[PDB]
Amino acid sequence: SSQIRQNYSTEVEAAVNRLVNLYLRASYTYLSLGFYFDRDDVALEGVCHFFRELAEEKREGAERLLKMQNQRGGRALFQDLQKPSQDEWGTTLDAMKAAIVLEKSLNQALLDLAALGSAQADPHLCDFLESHFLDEEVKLIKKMGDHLTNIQRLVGSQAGLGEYLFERLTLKHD
């Protein structure tokens, strides 16, 4: 069973398993975004790379939560993973707007879990989120917000031109 568990509430254990599901769902959403931008009829390499990187980051976040669950003596429980909300993701702008929505939802889940940890007097959990998740999320949301502003200023009356230039001159590509 366990022999190590100490100060680790059933409420936190369940919430961690839920958060793993949310991160894996987010990873799957980013996988879909990445491959949409690799379509020959979309063909925005830097946009593809941006979202493929996020798919890996979210998977790694789920793995870190699972490692922690076992370190505390809780039990990983996996649930079905829903498919992403869209099959096609529109423009770079549409995609970046969907990404910031998704990140705000993950951030709120992190904050909710931090608040649960405080309520449960679980300082290890609170430390864990502060150390590996909260600032990573703030940094990423700031980056997306920066990108949104630049994408928006490039729409002008020549959306295609602006979308190409943003991909070429802001996003990382070969």
35 binds, among Cl ion, a copy of itself, none (CB under 5 to 8 A by kind): a copy of itself
Torsion sign (Cα): 6, 112, 23, 61: negative
Q: Which of residues 23-52 bind a copy of itself (CB under 8 A)?
A: 28, 31-32, 35-36, 38-43, 45
157 binds, among Cl ion, a copy of itself, none (CB under 5 to 8 A by kind): a copy of itself
Q: Cβ distance 137 to 107 under 8 Å? A: yes
Site membership for a copy of itself, residue 171 (CB under 8 A): no
In the complex, which residue's CB is closest to Cl ion? 82
Site membership for a copy of itself, residue 165 (CB under 8 A): yes
120 binds, among Cl ion, a copy of itself, none (CB under 5 to 8 A by kind): none
Nearest 10 degrees: Cα torsion 51, 54, 59, 60: 150
Could you write out the three-class secondary structure of 125-162? HHHHHHHHHHHHHHHHHHHHHHHHHHHHHHHCCCHHHH
**Residue 125 one-letter amino acid:** L
- The site map against a copy of itself for 65-104 (x = CB under 8 A) is -xx-xxxxx-xxxxxxxxxx--x------------x---x
Residue written as tokens 């996003």?
A: 171
Site membership for Cl ion, residue 82 (CB under 5 A): yes
Q: Which residues bind Cl ion (CB under 5 A)?
A: 82
